[PDB]
Amino acid sequence: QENMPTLFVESVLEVHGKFVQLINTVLNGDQHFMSALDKALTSVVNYREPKSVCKAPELLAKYCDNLLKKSAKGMTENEVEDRLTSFITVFKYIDDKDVFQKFYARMLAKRLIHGLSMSMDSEEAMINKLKQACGYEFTSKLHRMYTDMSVSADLNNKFNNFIKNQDTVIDLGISFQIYVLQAGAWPLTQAPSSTFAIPQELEKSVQMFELFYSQHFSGRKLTWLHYLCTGEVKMNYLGKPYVAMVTTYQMAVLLAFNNSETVSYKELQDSTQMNEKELTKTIKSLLDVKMINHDSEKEDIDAESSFSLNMNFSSKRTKFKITTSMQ
Amino acid sequence: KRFEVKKWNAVALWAWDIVVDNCAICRNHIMDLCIECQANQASATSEECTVAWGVCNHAFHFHCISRWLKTRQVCPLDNREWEFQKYGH
DSSP: OOSHHHHHHHHHHHHHHHHHHHHHHHSTTOHHHHHHHHHHHHHHHTOOOTTSSOOHHHHHHHHHHHHHBGGGBTBOHHHHHHHHHHHHHHHTTOSOHHHHHHHHHHHHHHHHHTTOBSOHHHHHHHHHHHHHHHHHHHHHHHHHHHHHHHHHHHHHHHHHHHHHHSSSOOOOSSOOOOOOOOTTTSOOOOOOSSOOOOOHHHHHHHHHHHHHHTTTOOSSOOOOOTTTOEEEEEEOSSSSOEEEEEEHHHHHHHHHTTTOSEEEHHHHHHHHOOOHHHHHHHHHHHHHTTSEEESSSSSSOOTTOEEEEOTTOOOSSSEEEOOOTTO | OOOOOSSOOOOOOOOOOOOOSEETTTTEETTSOOHHHHTTTTSSSGGGOOEEEETTSOEEEHHHHHHHTTSOSBOTTTOOBOOEEEEEO
16 A cells, blocks of 8 residues: 555556557457457556555556656656656556546645646646546646646736836835635645734735735635745844744744744734644744743643743754644 | 844735526536536546636636537627636636
């Protein structure tokens, strides 16, 4: 079950290649034997891991995802394309292509949102190859995701132009970049269970963006996924200037210290409107890095806890990323 | 004792827009794939048919309207002329 993706595709390809060569050399390439080879491979590919729902679609998705990630460096773009072309041979034989599409969409979504894809051209070439192999249907959700990412550049340019075309140049005071994703195509269904009071520094960008975006699209309604959202917080309060890549919740917590050197759990909760679990995890992720101190004999967090900004914070790198699991 | 704005990010994504009625070209719910497409989800065309909206402020399954454009190009929900303006699944 742990390396099913790689081993499954390679094993099916070896079997396929052997028999194509046999049929061409010994059976004069007869289409009835080729059809028998294809039926045999279809019955074989529809394999499911022990106690699991059919995993071949998930495995093919994980494999293709591994080939499409930047980690295939040491392999050229051409070798990845040959490996993917071979993968398409296997992909045709999957019964539940929509299941592949939703797992691939989940892997591809994470690859696209976090920029883990080797090249956009390789992802598109893959989606077009899958389209030639399985038809439009199979790529419809994937093609829409890839389309949302490609149209996101024009959407950001439209937003920057929307701001420049208002009678007053509305300087956002922050660099704002955004990706708007279609909910029927994407497997991003995490509605924010916290009415996160967005920091004042972000609020202007958020409201101008909601006004701007609502003009163009429809269907299942995407909404601020503040937990997937990140930004940079620069600490100028220390003897060395530090830049922390932080989540929007971490950012909000750190931004509360702009109002005071000490902040209570309740003030952070009232100002950020985060739920207790995510606020606690957020604060904890700042405490573990020692960016904040806990003024209670416990270094760990309760509703009565007060936090003090760590005036003695030091890190080995001037720029660092606090990765909370919110992404 | 400073921590001030220079280059933040964060992300707020979209207000709303669901279409509540039925695609008059085949008479099935506008947000699902069209009847010919949902019934044949294994066909090369099927999953493509999500919501497409016209200047008519009415919407249809993308293949049904693209097929219907062989007929007079009017929306069968209000008979106004069709031109694609919004999209959604």
